[PDB]
Amino acid sequence: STGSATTTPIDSLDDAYITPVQIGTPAQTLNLDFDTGSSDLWVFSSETTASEVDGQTIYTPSKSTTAKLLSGATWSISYGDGSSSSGDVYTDTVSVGGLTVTGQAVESAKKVSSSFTEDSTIDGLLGLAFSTLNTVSPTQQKTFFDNAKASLDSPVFTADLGYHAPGTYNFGFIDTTAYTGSITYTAVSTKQGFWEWTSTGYAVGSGTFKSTSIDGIADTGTTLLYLPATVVSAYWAQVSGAKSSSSVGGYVFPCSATLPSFTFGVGSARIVIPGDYIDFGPISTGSSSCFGGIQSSAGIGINIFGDVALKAAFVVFNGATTPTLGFASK
């Protein structure tokens, strides 16, 4: 089997991407944030504290003839950005882009943190990291991809995120029309539960490529590109007037600037992030100071190849017995 679904930016800055997901019978379609950095499929629901729902579409398990409460199971997750959610668990039928999994754990939120409430466009998350990170207790549950894997034509999914435009998540096949040149594959460590890999270096603008190993994660659920302070400093030094602002929480730059591109290495291959992808707009409405899309990972504890990087590529998440990651230009 295969599936193919369009993923759409939630706003004009590409802060996150939503993908429609059918849950239950009859289908209840929710728009979920596909997150290769976590492993829980959780939804706003009829059980979510009412004051914590503000415009989201909810899953109502009582209206699904295939929903079953997973007795005794609870979940609770805290994300890198400080947000969180928790609740109980159903199993139900879940379909993405025509690919159906029966018996998928659907984690129903009883509580969500303010950042989720305030984002009316995201109805929940669909985790695509390794199932070892799943938070369900006392019996850990499998991700949608893990459940689907054996039925797929090939045990892969691909992320093709757009810049200010829709893109695609495919399951079970590689669309050879969706990229240019070749896909370069690189080793993955699953030791921390992530799609963790080592970039071979970087360049800023038209500058020379610096060969240096950068270990990090491919994370569709993180907006920005978080890299070591040395790398980030080298990038922003090429932007007149750019500075790190403790009050704002990262590098800012004059909105009148033209940003240089940023290149990252995948083996001997190179992915070029255009400068415009690195512009996250005014820090506050009407400001002429703009927020940078490349930020330091110092004190995150890990480098993160978030949407800023991934949307410059066609990315293969290869879930073979030994997982790997593939990147192509597009």
mmCIF file of C-alpha atoms in Angstrom:
data_model
loop_
_atom_site.group_PDB
_atom_site.id
_atom_site.type_symbol
_atom_site.label_atom_id
_atom_site.label_comp_id
_atom_site.label_asym_id
_atom_site.label_seq_id
_atom_site.Cartn_x
_atom_site.Cartn_y
_atom_site.Cartn_z
ATOM 1 C CA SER A 1 0.000 0.000 0.000
ATOM 2 C CA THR A 2 0.874 3.670 -0.222
ATOM 3 C CA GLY A 3 -0.482 7.015 0.958
ATOM 4 C CA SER A 4 -0.030 10.583 -0.265
ATOM 5 C CA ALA A 5 -1.281 13.695 1.486
ATOM 6 C CA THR A 6 -0.791 17.400 0.941
ATOM 7 C CA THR A 7 0.740 19.381 3.785
ATOM 8 C CA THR A 8 -0.002 23.109 4.060
ATOM 9 C CA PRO A 9 1.708 25.914 6.004
ATOM 10 C CA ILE A 10 -0.436 27.224 8.881
ATOM 11 C CA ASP A 11 0.507 30.856 8.267
ATOM 12 C CA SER A 12 2.498 33.212 6.048
ATOM 13 C CA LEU A 13 5.756 32.398 7.840
ATOM 14 C CA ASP A 14 5.620 28.593 7.489
ATOM 15 C CA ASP A 15 5.600 28.333 11.291
ATOM 16 C CA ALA A 16 4.311 24.761 10.976
ATOM 17 C CA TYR A 17 2.546 22.516 8.483
ATOM 18 C CA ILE A 18 -0.797 20.736 8.755
ATOM 19 C CA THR A 19 -1.898 17.568 7.008
ATOM 20 C CA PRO A 20 -5.475 16.224 6.975
ATOM 21 C CA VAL A 21 -5.952 12.911 8.770
ATOM 22 C CA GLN A 22 -9.104 10.765 8.852
ATOM 23 C CA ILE A 23 -9.859 9.261 12.269
ATOM 24 C CA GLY A 24 -12.709 6.922 13.132
ATOM 25 C CA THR A 25 -15.870 5.667 11.465
ATOM 26 C CA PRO A 26 -17.453 7.649 9.934
ATOM 27 C CA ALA A 27 -14.280 9.624 9.305
ATOM 28 C CA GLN A 28 -13.520 12.656 11.445
ATOM 29 C CA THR A 29 -10.942 14.732 9.586
ATOM 30 C CA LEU A 30 -8.466 16.619 11.773
ATOM 31 C CA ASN A 31 -5.513 18.695 10.595
ATOM 32 C CA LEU A 32 -2.426 17.357 12.317
ATOM 33 C CA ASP A 33 1.161 18.557 12.609
ATOM 34 C CA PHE A 34 3.356 15.699 11.325
ATOM 35 C CA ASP A 35 6.341 15.677 13.656
ATOM 36 C CA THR A 36 9.422 13.570 12.920
ATOM 37 C CA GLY A 37 10.787 14.681 16.309
ATOM 38 C CA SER A 38 8.157 12.944 18.468
ATOM 39 C CA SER A 39 6.208 9.701 18.580
ATOM 40 C CA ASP A 40 2.692 10.381 19.887
ATOM 41 C CA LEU A 41 -0.430 10.808 17.758
ATOM 42 C CA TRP A 42 -2.592 13.056 19.925
ATOM 43 C CA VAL A 43 -5.685 15.100 19.181
ATOM 44 C CA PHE A 44 -7.904 17.782 20.574
ATOM 45 C CA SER A 45 -11.043 15.946 21.575
ATOM 46 C CA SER A 46 -14.436 16.019 23.241
ATOM 47 C CA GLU A 47 -12.468 15.304 26.441
ATOM 48 C CA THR A 48 -10.258 18.392 26.204
ATOM 49 C CA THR A 49 -10.794 20.953 28.977
ATOM 50 C CA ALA A 50 -13.262 23.337 27.355
ATOM 51 C CA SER A 51 -11.391 26.551 28.219
ATOM 52 C CA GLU A 52 -8.359 25.065 26.454
ATOM 53 C CA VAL A 53 -10.128 24.632 23.109
ATOM 54 C CA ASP A 54 -10.215 27.743 20.908
ATOM 55 C CA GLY A 55 -11.224 26.945 17.329
ATOM 56 C CA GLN A 56 -9.651 23.508 16.854
ATOM 57 C CA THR A 57 -11.543 20.627 15.312
ATOM 58 C CA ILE A 58 -12.038 17.887 17.904
ATOM 59 C CA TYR A 59 -12.142 14.115 17.770
ATOM 60 C CA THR A 60 -15.244 12.700 19.456
ATOM 61 C CA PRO A 61 -14.600 9.012 20.110
ATOM 62 C CA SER A 62 -18.208 8.359 21.171
ATOM 63 C CA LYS A 63 -19.272 9.145 17.586
ATOM 64 C CA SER A 64 -16.837 6.616 16.103
ATOM 65 C CA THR A 65 -18.108 3.045 15.852
ATOM 66 C CA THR A 66 -14.521 1.761 15.641
ATOM 67 C CA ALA A 67 -13.178 3.683 18.678
ATOM 68 C CA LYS A 68 -12.223 1.635 21.728
ATOM 69 C CA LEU A 69 -10.924 3.015 25.008
ATOM 70 C CA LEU A 70 -7.490 1.566 25.768
ATOM 71 C CA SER A 71 -8.132 0.575 29.346
ATOM 72 C CA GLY A 72 -5.864 2.181 31.909
ATOM 73 C CA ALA A 73 -3.681 3.969 29.369
ATOM 74 C CA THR A 74 -2.610 7.579 29.814
ATOM 75 C CA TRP A 75 -0.086 9.837 28.107
ATOM 76 C CA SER A 76 1.774 13.041 28.873
ATOM 77 C CA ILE A 77 4.311 14.797 26.688
ATOM 78 C CA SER A 78 6.557 17.828 26.981
ATOM 79 C CA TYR A 79 8.105 19.263 23.827
ATOM 80 C CA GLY A 80 11.398 21.041 23.266
ATOM 81 C CA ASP A 81 9.695 24.419 23.002
ATOM 82 C CA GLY A 82 8.116 24.068 26.452
ATOM 83 C CA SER A 83 4.619 23.126 25.297
ATOM 84 C CA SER A 84 2.805 20.080 26.653
ATOM 85 C CA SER A 85 -0.338 17.979 26.556
ATOM 86 C CA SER A 86 -1.775 14.893 28.272
ATOM 87 C CA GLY A 87 -4.810 12.631 28.420
ATOM 88 C CA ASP A 88 -6.137 9.134 27.815
ATOM 89 C CA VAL A 89 -6.022 6.747 24.849
ATOM 90 C CA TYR A 90 -8.324 5.180 22.305
ATOM 91 C CA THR A 91 -7.576 2.841 19.455
ATOM 92 C CA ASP A 92 -9.283 3.648 16.169
ATOM 93 C CA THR A 93 -8.890 3.574 12.413
ATOM 94 C CA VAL A 94 -6.586 6.259 11.067
ATOM 95 C CA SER A 95 -6.041 7.102 7.418
ATOM 96 C CA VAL A 96 -3.510 9.442 5.810
ATOM 97 C CA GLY A 97 -3.741 10.169 2.127
ATOM 98 C CA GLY A 98 -5.488 6.868 1.393
ATOM 99 C CA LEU A 99 -3.277 4.715 3.648
ATOM 100 C CA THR A 100 -5.266 3.108 6.461
ATOM 101 C CA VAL A 101 -4.112 1.714 9.824
ATOM 102 C CA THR A 102 -6.594 -0.096 12.042
ATOM 103 C CA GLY A 103 -6.024 -0.194 15.794
ATOM 104 C CA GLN A 104 -3.912 2.983 15.852
ATOM 105 C CA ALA A 105 -3.418 4.543 19.280
ATOM 106 C CA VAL A 106 -5.149 7.913 19.190
ATOM 107 C CA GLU A 107 -4.176 9.881 22.260
ATOM 108 C CA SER A 108 -7.071 12.089 23.362
ATOM 109 C CA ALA A 109 -6.052 15.297 25.101
ATOM 110 C CA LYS A 110 -7.642 16.169 28.412
ATOM 111 C CA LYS A 111 -5.201 19.064 28.894
ATOM 112 C CA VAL A 112 -3.099 21.130 26.496
ATOM 113 C CA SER A 113 -0.727 24.026 27.192
ATOM 114 C CA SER A 114 -1.486 27.584 26.162
ATOM 115 C CA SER A 115 0.530 27.500 22.928
ATOM 116 C CA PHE A 116 -1.669 24.684 21.605
ATOM 117 C CA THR A 117 -4.886 26.421 22.653
ATOM 118 C CA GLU A 118 -3.740 29.612 20.962
ATOM 119 C CA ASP A 119 -3.048 27.878 17.662
ATOM 120 C CA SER A 120 -6.505 27.258 16.196
ATOM 121 C CA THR A 121 -5.062 25.707 13.029
ATOM 122 C CA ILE A 122 -3.427 22.645 14.644
ATOM 123 C CA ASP A 123 -5.823 19.924 15.798
ATOM 124 C CA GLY A 124 -3.066 17.683 17.171
ATOM 125 C CA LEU A 125 0.239 16.025 16.308
ATOM 126 C CA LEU A 126 1.166 12.890 14.412
ATOM 127 C CA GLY A 127 4.542 11.684 15.592
ATOM 128 C CA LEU A 128 6.934 10.097 13.102
ATOM 129 C CA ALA A 129 10.051 9.583 15.250
ATOM 130 C CA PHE A 130 10.822 6.123 16.638
ATOM 131 C CA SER A 131 8.223 4.373 18.779
ATOM 132 C CA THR A 132 10.687 4.133 21.692
ATOM 133 C CA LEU A 133 9.787 7.802 22.453
ATOM 134 C CA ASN A 134 6.035 7.166 22.670
ATOM 135 C CA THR A 135 4.721 8.364 26.040
ATOM 136 C CA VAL A 136 1.727 6.052 26.562
ATOM 137 C CA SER A 137 1.783 4.300 29.922
ATOM 138 C CA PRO A 138 1.757 1.591 31.138
ATOM 139 C CA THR A 139 1.952 0.041 27.639
ATOM 140 C CA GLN A 140 3.929 2.048 25.062
ATOM 141 C CA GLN A 141 2.200 2.394 21.685
ATOM 142 C CA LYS A 142 3.451 2.424 18.095
ATOM 143 C CA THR A 143 3.492 5.343 15.682
ATOM 144 C CA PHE A 144 1.314 5.447 12.580
ATOM 145 C CA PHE A 145 4.360 4.732 10.427
ATOM 146 C CA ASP A 146 5.469 1.799 12.599
ATOM 147 C CA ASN A 147 1.966 0.293 12.342
ATOM 148 C CA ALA A 148 1.768 0.883 8.579
ATOM 149 C CA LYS A 149 5.279 -0.247 7.753
ATOM 150 C CA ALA A 150 4.737 -3.921 6.995
ATOM 151 C CA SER A 151 1.894 -3.132 4.587
ATOM 152 C CA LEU A 152 3.786 -0.431 2.685
ATOM 153 C CA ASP A 153 5.249 -1.107 -0.765
ATOM 154 C CA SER A 154 8.586 0.124 0.673
ATOM 155 C CA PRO A 155 9.180 0.916 4.379
ATOM 156 C CA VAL A 156 9.665 4.655 3.866
ATOM 157 C CA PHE A 157 7.988 7.983 4.097
ATOM 158 C CA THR A 158 9.026 11.246 2.466
ATOM 159 C CA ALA A 159 8.690 14.887 3.436
ATOM 160 C CA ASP A 160 8.482 17.490 0.683
ATOM 161 C CA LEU A 161 7.692 20.720 2.515
ATOM 162 C CA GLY A 162 6.967 23.877 0.544
ATOM 163 C CA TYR A 163 8.300 27.374 1.006
ATOM 164 C CA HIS A 164 5.211 29.548 1.434
ATOM 165 C CA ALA A 165 3.350 26.841 -0.497
ATOM 166 C CA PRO A 166 1.809 23.398 -0.079
ATOM 167 C CA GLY A 167 3.912 20.244 -0.165
ATOM 168 C CA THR A 168 3.517 16.516 0.300
ATOM 169 C CA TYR A 169 3.974 13.630 2.710
ATOM 170 C CA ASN A 170 4.150 10.260 0.937
ATOM 171 C CA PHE A 171 4.112 6.845 2.588
ATOM 172 C CA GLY A 172 5.440 3.692 0.987
ATOM 173 C CA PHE A 173 7.064 5.062 -2.173
ATOM 174 C CA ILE A 174 9.564 7.593 -3.480
ATOM 175 C CA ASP A 175 8.137 9.992 -6.097
ATOM 176 C CA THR A 176 11.044 10.231 -8.530
ATOM 177 C CA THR A 177 9.425 13.278 -10.174
ATOM 178 C CA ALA A 178 9.553 15.293 -6.931
ATOM 179 C CA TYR A 179 13.295 16.046 -6.829
ATOM 180 C CA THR A 180 16.235 16.910 -9.060
ATOM 181 C CA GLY A 181 19.495 14.977 -9.342
ATOM 182 C CA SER A 182 20.040 12.075 -6.970
ATOM 183 C CA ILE A 183 19.049 11.272 -3.424
ATOM 184 C CA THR A 184 22.069 11.046 -1.120
ATOM 185 C CA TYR A 185 21.590 8.710 1.804
ATOM 186 C CA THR A 186 23.297 9.090 5.148
ATOM 187 C CA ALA A 187 23.486 7.011 8.354
ATOM 188 C CA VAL A 188 20.981 7.391 11.183
ATOM 189 C CA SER A 189 21.387 6.751 14.889
ATOM 190 C CA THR A 190 18.181 5.745 16.645
ATOM 191 C CA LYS A 191 19.838 5.786 20.081
ATOM 192 C CA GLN A 192 17.892 8.856 21.244
ATOM 193 C CA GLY A 193 14.693 7.897 19.392
ATOM 194 C CA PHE A 194 15.187 10.537 16.674
ATOM 195 C CA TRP A 195 16.102 10.622 13.001
ATOM 196 C CA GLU A 196 19.615 11.615 14.067
ATOM 197 C CA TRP A 197 22.338 12.036 11.456
ATOM 198 C CA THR A 198 25.634 13.860 10.835
ATOM 199 C CA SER A 199 25.906 16.660 8.315
ATOM 200 C CA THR A 200 29.302 16.973 6.670
ATOM 201 C CA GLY A 201 29.555 20.764 6.916
ATOM 202 C CA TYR A 202 28.252 24.098 5.731
ATOM 203 C CA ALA A 203 28.775 27.228 3.647
ATOM 204 C CA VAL A 204 27.416 30.756 3.999
ATOM 205 C CA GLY A 205 26.297 32.433 0.792
ATOM 206 C CA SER A 206 28.889 32.035 -1.925
ATOM 207 C CA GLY A 207 31.593 31.275 0.649
ATOM 208 C CA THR A 208 33.823 28.235 0.801
ATOM 209 C CA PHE A 209 32.425 25.031 2.249
ATOM 210 C CA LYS A 210 33.633 24.170 5.744
ATOM 211 C CA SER A 211 34.009 20.445 6.270
ATOM 212 C CA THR A 212 32.914 19.691 9.817
ATOM 213 C CA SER A 213 30.655 17.070 11.388
ATOM 214 C CA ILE A 214 27.353 18.407 12.712
ATOM 215 C CA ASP A 215 25.226 15.827 14.509
ATOM 216 C CA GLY A 216 21.549 16.715 14.586
ATOM 217 C CA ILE A 217 17.992 15.570 14.025
ATOM 218 C CA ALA A 218 15.669 15.847 11.034
ATOM 219 C CA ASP A 219 12.615 17.360 12.709
ATOM 220 C CA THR A 220 9.577 18.420 10.700
ATOM 221 C CA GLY A 221 7.925 19.635 13.910
ATOM 222 C CA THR A 222 10.518 22.335 14.598
ATOM 223 C CA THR A 223 10.210 25.532 12.580
ATOM 224 C CA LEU A 224 13.800 26.765 12.530
ATOM 225 C CA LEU A 225 17.340 25.524 11.902
ATOM 226 C CA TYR A 226 19.259 25.235 15.189
ATOM 227 C CA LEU A 227 23.019 24.804 14.817
ATOM 228 C CA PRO A 228 26.171 25.262 16.902
ATOM 229 C CA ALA A 229 26.950 28.813 18.015
ATOM 230 C CA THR A 230 30.117 28.932 15.911
ATOM 231 C CA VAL A 231 28.180 28.128 12.718
ATOM 232 C CA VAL A 232 25.339 30.527 13.494
ATOM 233 C CA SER A 233 27.744 33.357 14.315
ATOM 234 C CA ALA A 234 29.496 32.820 10.975
ATOM 235 C CA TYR A 235 26.156 33.033 9.168
ATOM 236 C CA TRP A 236 24.862 36.224 10.822
ATOM 237 C CA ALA A 237 28.241 37.949 10.520
ATOM 238 C CA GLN A 238 27.426 38.147 6.795
ATOM 239 C CA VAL A 239 24.279 40.201 7.450
ATOM 240 C CA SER A 240 24.853 43.891 8.111
ATOM 241 C CA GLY A 241 23.267 44.932 11.380
ATOM 242 C CA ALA A 242 22.399 41.430 12.558
ATOM 243 C CA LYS A 243 22.858 40.719 16.254
ATOM 244 C CA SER A 244 21.899 38.258 18.932
ATOM 245 C CA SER A 245 19.209 39.737 21.145
ATOM 246 C CA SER A 246 18.710 38.239 24.599
ATOM 247 C CA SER A 247 15.458 40.204 24.990
ATOM 248 C CA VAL A 248 13.993 38.833 21.755
ATOM 249 C CA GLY A 249 15.486 35.359 22.195
ATOM 250 C CA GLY A 250 17.870 34.977 19.293
ATOM 251 C CA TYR A 251 19.410 36.538 16.238
ATOM 252 C CA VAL A 252 17.558 39.436 14.676
ATOM 253 C CA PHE A 253 18.406 41.432 11.567
ATOM 254 C CA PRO A 254 17.256 44.591 9.781
ATOM 255 C CA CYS A 255 14.163 43.794 7.746
ATOM 256 C CA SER A 256 15.779 45.741 4.845
ATOM 257 C CA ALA A 257 18.578 43.159 4.583
ATOM 258 C CA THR A 258 19.074 40.684 1.763
ATOM 259 C CA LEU A 259 19.929 37.382 3.480
ATOM 260 C CA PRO A 260 22.628 35.061 2.148
ATOM 261 C CA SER A 261 21.864 31.435 1.447
ATOM 262 C CA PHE A 262 23.040 28.665 3.773
ATOM 263 C CA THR A 263 24.375 25.350 2.463
ATOM 264 C CA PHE A 264 24.543 22.127 4.469
ATOM 265 C CA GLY A 265 26.350 18.930 3.539
ATOM 266 C CA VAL A 266 24.846 15.483 3.181
ATOM 267 C CA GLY A 267 27.815 13.249 2.476
ATOM 268 C CA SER A 268 29.454 14.766 -0.617
ATOM 269 C CA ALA A 269 26.151 16.391 -1.639
ATOM 270 C CA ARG A 270 24.964 19.887 -0.794
ATOM 271 C CA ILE A 271 21.542 21.318 0.034
ATOM 272 C CA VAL A 272 21.165 25.061 -0.467
ATOM 273 C CA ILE A 273 18.697 26.968 1.703
ATOM 274 C CA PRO A 274 17.846 30.242 -0.083
ATOM 275 C CA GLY A 275 18.239 33.396 1.966
ATOM 276 C CA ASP A 276 14.527 34.172 1.884
ATOM 277 C CA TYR A 277 13.814 30.883 3.729
ATOM 278 C CA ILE A 278 15.739 32.330 6.682
ATOM 279 C CA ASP A 279 13.464 35.395 7.055
ATOM 280 C CA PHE A 280 10.827 35.022 9.796
ATOM 281 C CA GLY A 281 9.573 38.569 9.554
ATOM 282 C CA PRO A 282 9.121 41.387 12.039
ATOM 283 C CA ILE A 283 9.718 40.504 15.676
ATOM 284 C CA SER A 284 6.477 42.271 16.523
ATOM 285 C CA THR A 285 3.858 43.839 14.299
ATOM 286 C CA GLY A 286 5.230 46.939 12.591
ATOM 287 C CA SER A 287 8.840 46.433 13.684
ATOM 288 C CA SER A 288 11.745 46.878 11.268
ATOM 289 C CA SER A 289 13.706 44.239 13.182
ATOM 290 C CA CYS A 290 13.199 40.760 11.732
ATOM 291 C CA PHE A 291 13.657 37.329 13.326
ATOM 292 C CA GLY A 292 16.254 34.956 11.937
ATOM 293 C CA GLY A 293 15.543 31.418 10.795
ATOM 294 C CA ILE A 294 18.958 30.091 11.795
ATOM 295 C CA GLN A 295 19.493 30.121 15.555
ATOM 296 C CA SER A 296 21.961 28.713 18.065
ATOM 297 C CA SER A 297 21.345 25.266 19.512
ATOM 298 C CA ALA A 298 23.505 26.098 22.539
ATOM 299 C CA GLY A 299 21.513 25.056 25.580
ATOM 300 C CA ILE A 300 18.994 23.052 23.537
ATOM 301 C CA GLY A 301 21.484 20.231 23.820
ATOM 302 C CA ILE A 302 20.983 19.049 20.244
ATOM 303 C CA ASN A 303 21.214 20.479 16.736
ATOM 304 C CA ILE A 304 17.894 20.503 14.894
ATOM 305 C CA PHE A 305 17.403 20.457 11.132
ATOM 306 C CA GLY A 306 13.898 21.888 11.317
ATOM 307 C CA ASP A 307 11.592 23.114 8.582
ATOM 308 C CA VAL A 308 13.938 25.900 7.407
ATOM 309 C CA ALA A 309 16.418 23.200 6.322
ATOM 310 C CA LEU A 310 14.046 20.397 5.399
ATOM 311 C CA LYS A 311 11.863 22.494 3.089
ATOM 312 C CA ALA A 312 14.923 23.123 0.879
ATOM 313 C CA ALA A 313 15.050 19.353 0.177
ATOM 314 C CA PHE A 314 13.130 16.243 -0.708
ATOM 315 C CA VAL A 315 13.723 14.086 2.386
ATOM 316 C CA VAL A 316 13.466 10.303 2.613
ATOM 317 C CA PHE A 317 12.867 8.762 6.036
ATOM 318 C CA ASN A 318 13.913 5.181 5.361
ATOM 319 C CA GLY A 319 12.510 2.849 8.020
ATOM 320 C CA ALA A 320 14.263 -0.280 6.809
ATOM 321 C CA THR A 321 15.777 -2.599 9.434
ATOM 322 C CA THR A 322 18.743 -0.244 9.508
ATOM 323 C CA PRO A 323 17.157 3.192 9.077
ATOM 324 C CA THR A 324 18.761 5.886 6.932
ATOM 325 C CA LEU A 325 17.921 9.396 5.748
ATOM 326 C CA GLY A 326 18.017 10.594 2.173
ATOM 327 C CA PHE A 327 18.215 14.178 0.882
ATOM 328 C CA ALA A 328 17.790 15.506 -2.654
ATOM 329 C CA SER A 329 17.603 19.007 -4.058
ATOM 330 C CA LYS A 330 14.314 19.958 -5.713
#
